[PDB]
Ligand binder design. Structure first.
Ligand code: MG
Ligand code: MG
Ligand code: MG
Ligand code: MG
Ligand code: MG
Ligand code: MG
Ligand code: MG
Ligand code: MG
Ligand code: MG
Ligand code: MG
Ligand code: MG
Ligand code: MG
Lengths: 139, 62, 97, 86, 143, 63, 139, 190
RNA sequence: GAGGGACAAGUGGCGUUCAGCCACCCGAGAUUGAGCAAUAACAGGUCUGUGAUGCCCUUAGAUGUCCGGGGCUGCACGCGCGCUACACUGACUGGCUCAGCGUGUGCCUACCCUACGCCGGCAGGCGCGGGUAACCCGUUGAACCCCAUUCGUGAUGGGGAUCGGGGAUUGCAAUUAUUCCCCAUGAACGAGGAAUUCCCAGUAAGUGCGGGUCAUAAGCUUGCGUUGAUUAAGUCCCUGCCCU
């Protein structure tokens, strides 16, 4: 009946801290993994939802990290990933927690060279989709 | 320190800065037919048994 | 074969209905009833004002479109004989064979 | 920017209180010992009094229901109603 | 005796029928629904693993109720309250892919006859199947 | 509620002044008598006038 | 033998066809024990759990409702049964028992024979509801 | 032919131990109904509200605060769970302790303004018994709501605990807390 | 469609002969909600609705009119009407079950309502049919609500603002506004001080739908439906009004 397994908090990708309430909602704590993607990776890994994060095998953790680093070998088509076709490489992949901030830095680094007003309003204290900025953006 | 009860015989009128209390000359159940006038706020009819915490007062009418 | 009497107002509707039933009783035709239709209403709400001063005071304009349908199986000569009716101008007549 | 609010009401119940995810050895042993002593087996009392979460409380109550020690009166949306005979 | 599906409560009927359709093996589930499919316009996936058989049982119950519904009609039958966030909620509709999937699967398993003017309607084989399943569910209820 | 208009009371006084023997002490008969002897288009006004006519009949029957 | 009694809830109408038989109440092909809320499985049975069992076994009534709300349909079924028994006791059974059972129904409840004269009022052109107004702006 | 019963209940021999609240609680046989969700049309006459049953009044005062403003089926279910919890707590019938809570759940007098257009002294005056029933039901449902706010306990469980701690003079319920808050101020301004 | 039914009529009491008031019953109701709404004024708004208009201004490089961009959306700020939350009466998932106003085409001049089947996960595309309308959308299988699972008091799965990549639709053109959909990023917010707005029975509030602009287009407004409170039915104390 699973009395107690010696597992409290895991460590994934050197920055993220896994929780203790579930397994999908602890993979949700990884940046770049949110509401639906964690449950999709769990359903590909075929793990029962009643089991916690402290009741799961480290080999299965490595299998989940394998699905993270290469999802396209089995399943999960190109629409569901975070990073779509516009890469400057044209590669269909899922971003990491350390990788997402680096991709945002590359986005802003090329938008500063483009000098588009989207990058200009992000560099200044303005909003891109903030069409009205009377009440929006105070303090 | 007695706590007595009393049923309403008649209703005189309504009184207050808001017009909320009702001056009620109630009656005495536990004794003979004697008369005190009480200020009762809230709805009241003729025959409502009222809880009295002090049977020593007397309100005045105008 | 059906005949639709669509009127602007209820008084001319009932007058042309009574006149048509009075003209249809004496002939040898199985006359169906003046089938009542639901009254249509075009509700229009208006600001009442060109400039926005005062409370939001709105109009409510309506019409009462009234309609009746009857069924009269008859030859076309008898239908064209019944068609000639001294009628109120607020009543429109449609025929369908 | 600045943080300003018009009311000041701090000091809640207990300071981000911890709560057990899975039942321990001695904790579940104490549960099995004094679970006949409670007359009204409700998951809120089992969770708040005995340092249990709601999910582990419902899991333990369904486990004792499958064991057949506490009789269910009427189960519903969120008011699980259990009672022990005698 | 005579058992009607309205005589028995539904939350026993669909809960048994989602397993009797597993026992009969009447499901088509090609590739994308094997992978993952979300709800109407939502953020999560259904929980109980037999949700395909649950949708098929609800489709069978609704085609027993109303004969002549279609893909869009059954999509409006399912329906949805689309919570948008700051913008208030409205009534959105479900997906048409499962709505044609379940009808195509039951047509391949010989339970849906097409209408010449509308869509799905009942078959005598599916009538016998649902009537015997409702009878054994009523027998399990009374026993 | 019965604080009726002067034209209503004046019409009912004209009715009770001209035609008394045609009126009785029943509302459903006095209304039909008043609508046989007078012209009132509004049915609420018919009921109002006939009620005050019955009230005047109950006053005349006493004193 | 065949008397159909109608509804008259606020936006709910229950046609109740009566018939002599062996004990049946049909609500849109669905029997008496099935009520669309689970909470109201004492209010709809008030003609059943108060008036006896031989009346239920003697009178068969099918009920078809074209209501608009659930509570409106429940009270429409209740009023349609409680008036269809009165109509069947007018058309078949003697008045010496009809008046007794009518006095029992009246002294139990008012809404068994008398309908509710309550319809929703029109929304006003000044405020958001039938009585309310919007918020003012003073200084 | 059977007795009028809520669920599997009896609704009999529920005795009001005192006067000044008699003929206002509908617990008797002449006003016994099967569910609180009844045809509530008691807002026309000034004195037809007292014929409403106190369980229906408790449901109507329980449904408040916008997010639950309505849902009589839900609040009748909540009061059903509360009566079931009170019954399973060593018997001590929920209808009887509900009547006892209406009797002993708050004010016996209140202080308010007097006229004279002068100094407001807030003289302690009498209170209507209907107003005592109203304020008792209001304090019980408010205490149950703020006891079941932000916890694991439910509305029904805290309402059952509130009715038990109000029927028993333990001075640990919010109805008795506001009873203290009203009667100490009433004795001070007496 | 016509007619009926309700008028304080019948009883008791209080009131002056009166005028009238309170409770009962028969009744569906002992009266619902709107429209119109007097004399005389505001030195209230509209010349930016009118080929409705007086005076002045411009009339040939035009203050007339077309075409191509920007703008009214621009933000160190304060204010008003509103929507969503601050969770467990709840959030998620699955099942069940109910409507009413009202709208819809080849127009006194350019345009919809969409049913059925197939494909795509999605917004959507394709073939075909009906409706100038109680015919078809449509028996508007609506949301809350009715049951079962998950969550467990943790800024948490409540909240979805902000931001990045992509996919479809109207439009000739959406980037410094369309809109919608998929993933991801997940702040403040712990029921709000001084002050203040609305409301007495199908009422406020919760919740959804139809019309107006519409092409894409509602968080506004007008109407309609579902569930449906607590408590007054009194007063002139704050404010304002009517008559001496
Ligand atoms: Mg303001
Ligand atoms: Mg609110
Ligand atoms: Mg000219
Ligand atoms: Mg502007
Ligand atoms: Mg400006
Ligand atoms: Mg405004
Ligand atoms: Mg959320
Ligand atoms: Mg969060
Ligand atoms: Mg809401
Ligand atoms: Mg449109
Ligand atoms: Mg629109
Ligand atoms: Mg606008």
């Amino acid at each position: 009946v699973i009395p107690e397994k010696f597992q409290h908090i895991l460590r994934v990708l050197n920055t993220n801290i896994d929780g203790r309430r579930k397994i999908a909602f602890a993979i949700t704590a990884i940046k770049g993994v949110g509401r639906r993607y964690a449950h999709v990776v769990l359903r590909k890994a075929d793990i029962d939802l009643t089991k916690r994060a402290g009741e799961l095998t480290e080999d299965e953790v490595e299998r989940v990290i394998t699905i993270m680093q290469n999802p396209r070998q089995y399943k999960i088509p190109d629409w569901f990933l975070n990073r779509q076709k516009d890469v400057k490489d044209g590669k269909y992949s899922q971003v990491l927690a350390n990788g997402l901030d680096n991709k945002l830095r590359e986005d802003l680094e090329r938008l500063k060279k483009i000098r588009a007003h989207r990058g200009l309003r992000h560099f200044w204290g303005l909003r891109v989709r903030g069409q009205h900025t009377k009440t929006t953006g105070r303090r | 320190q007695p706590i007595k009860l009393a049923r309403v015989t008649k209703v005189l009128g309504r009184t207050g800065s808001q017009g909320q209390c009702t001056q009620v000359r109630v009656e005495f159940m536990d004794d003979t037919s004697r008369s005190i006038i009480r200020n009762v706020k809230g709805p009241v009819r003729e025959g409502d048994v009222l809880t009295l915490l002090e049977s020593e007062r007397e309100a005045r009418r105008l | 074969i059906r005949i639709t009497l669509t009127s602007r107002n209820v008084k001319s509707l009932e007058k042309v209905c009574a006149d048509l039933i009075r003209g249809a009783k004496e002939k040898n035709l199985k006359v169906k009833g003046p089938v009542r239709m639901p009254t249509k209403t075009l509700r229009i709400t208006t600001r009442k004002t060109p400039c926005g001063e005062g409370s939001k005071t709105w109009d409510r304009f309506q019409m009462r479109i009234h309609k009746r349908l009857i069924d009269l199986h008859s030859p076309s000569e008898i239908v064209k004989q019944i068609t000639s009716i001294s009628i109120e101008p607020g009543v429109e007549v449609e025929v369908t064979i | 920017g600045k943080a300003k609010k018009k009311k000041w009401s701090k000091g809640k119940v207990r300071d981000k209180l911890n709560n057990l995810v899975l039942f321990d050895k001695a904790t579940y042993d104490k549960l099995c010992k004094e679970v006949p002593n409670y007359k009204l087996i409700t998951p809120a009392v089992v969770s708040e009094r005995l340092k249990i979460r709601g999910s582990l409380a419902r899991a333990a109550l369904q486990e004792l229901l499958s064991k057949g020690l506490i009789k269910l009166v009427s189960k519903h949306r969120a008011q699980v109603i259990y009672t022990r005979n005698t | 005796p005579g058992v009607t599906v309205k005589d028995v409560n539904q939350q026993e009927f669909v809960r048994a029928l989602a397993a009797f359709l597993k026992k009969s093996g009447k499901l088509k589930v090609p590739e994308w629904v094997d992978t993952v499919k979300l709800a109407k316009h939502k953020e999560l996936a259904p929980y109980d693993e037999n949700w395909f058989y649950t949708r098929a049982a609800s489709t069978a119950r609704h085609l027993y109720l109303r004969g002549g519904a279609g893909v869009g009609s059954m999509t409006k039958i399912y329906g949805g309250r689309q919570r948008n966030g700051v913008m208030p909620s409205h009534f959105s509709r479900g997906s048409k892919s499962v709505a044609r999937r379940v009808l195509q699967a039951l047509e391949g398993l010989k339970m849906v006859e097409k209408d010449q003017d509308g869509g799905r309607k009942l078959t005598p084989q599916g009538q016998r199947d649902l009537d015997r399943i409702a009878g054994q569910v009523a027998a399990a209820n009374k026993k | 509620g019965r604080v009726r208009t002067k034209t209503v009371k004046k019409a009912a006084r004209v009715i009770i002044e001209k035609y008394y023997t045609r009126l009785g002490n029943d509302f459903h008969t006095n209304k039909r008598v008043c609508e046989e002897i007078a012209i009132i288009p509004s049915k609420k006004l018919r009921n109002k006038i006939a009620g005050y006519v019955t009230h005047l009949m109950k006053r005349i029957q006493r004193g | 033998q065949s008397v159909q009694v109608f509804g008259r809830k606020k936006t709910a109408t229950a046609v109740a066809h009566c018939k002599r038989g062996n004990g049946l109440i049909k609500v849109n092909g669905r029997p008496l024990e099935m009520i669309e809320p689970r909470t109201l499985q004492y209010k709809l049975l008030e003609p059943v759990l108060l008036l006896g069992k031989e009346r239920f076994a003697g009178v068969d009534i099918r009920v078809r409702v074209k209501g608009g709300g659930h509570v409106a349909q429940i009270y429409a079924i209740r009023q349609s049964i409680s008036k269809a028994l009165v109509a069947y006791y007018q058309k078949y059974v003697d008045e010496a028992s009809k008046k007794e059972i009518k006095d029992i129904l009246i002294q139990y409840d008012r809404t068994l024979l008398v309908a509710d004269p309550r319809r929703c009022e029109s929304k006003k052109f000044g405020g958001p509801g039938a009585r309310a107004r919007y918020q003012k702006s003073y200084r | 032919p059977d007795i009028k019963l809520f669920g599997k209940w009896s609704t009999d021999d529920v005795q009001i131990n005192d006067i000044s609240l008699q003929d206002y609680i509908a617990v008797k046989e002449k006003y016994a109904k099967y569910l609180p969700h009844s045809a509530g049309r008691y807002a026309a006459k000034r004195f037809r509200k007292a014929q409403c049953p106190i369980v229906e009044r408790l449901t109507n005062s329980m449904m408040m605060h916008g997010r639950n403003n309505g849902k009589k089926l839900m609040t009748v279910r909540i009061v059903k769970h509360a009566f079931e919890i009170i019954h399973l707590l060593t018997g001590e019938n929920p209808l009887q302790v509900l009547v006892n809570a209406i009797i002993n759940s708050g004010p016996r007098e209140d202080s308010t303004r007097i006229g004279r257009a002068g100094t407001v002294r807030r003289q302690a005056v009498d209170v209507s018994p209907l107003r005592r029933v109203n304020q008792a039901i209001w304090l019980l449902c408010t205490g149950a709501r703020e006891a079941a706010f932000r916890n694991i306990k439910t509305i029904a469980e805290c309402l059952a605990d509130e009715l038990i701690n109000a029927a028993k003079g333990s001075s640990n319920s919010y109805a008795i807390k506001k009873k203290d808050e009203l009667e100490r101020v009433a004795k001070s301004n007496r």
